[PDB]
């Protein structure tokens, strides 16, 4: 039974490193379009005033 328990995570821990790696960027890489959000909302009011 302990053969299976050890073999459950024989391949997991090293494959979780790239998992832990990429998950960090994919979470904390949302700032570039956050600034684009600032200019996208800047565009809407620019359209809004001229439409007004």
């Amino acid at each position: 039974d302990r053969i299976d328990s050890v073999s459950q995570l024989q391949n997991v821990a090293e494959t979780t490193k790239v998992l832990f790696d990429v998950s960090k960027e994919t979470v904390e890489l949302e700032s570039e379009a956050f600034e684009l959000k600032q200019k996208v909302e800047l565009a809407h009011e620019a359209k809004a005033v001229l439409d007004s």
């Binding site: 904390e28 956050f34 600034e35 600032q38 800047l42 009011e45 620019a46 809004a48 005033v49 007004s52």
Partner: protein, 89 residues
Amino acid sequence: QDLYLRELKDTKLAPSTLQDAEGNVKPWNPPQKPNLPELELQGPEALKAYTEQNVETAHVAKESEEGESEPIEEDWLVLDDAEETKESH
């Protein structure tokens, strides 16, 4: 013929000073000038908001930081809590 020409001429007397020229307006007692080009020129921005969205307030986006760059007091606690979870896992 004349009855059209004279009313065409009439379009060059009564409304000629109205919009064709800027001689105010004779038939009307209220004036035409201090309504649209000065009071209602800001009228479109009297309907919307001024000095905030017509100026448009191009504002710097508020900057958000990371987890205070303080890993040692939380990563090991998370590691200690990871021990707690994996006993329950």
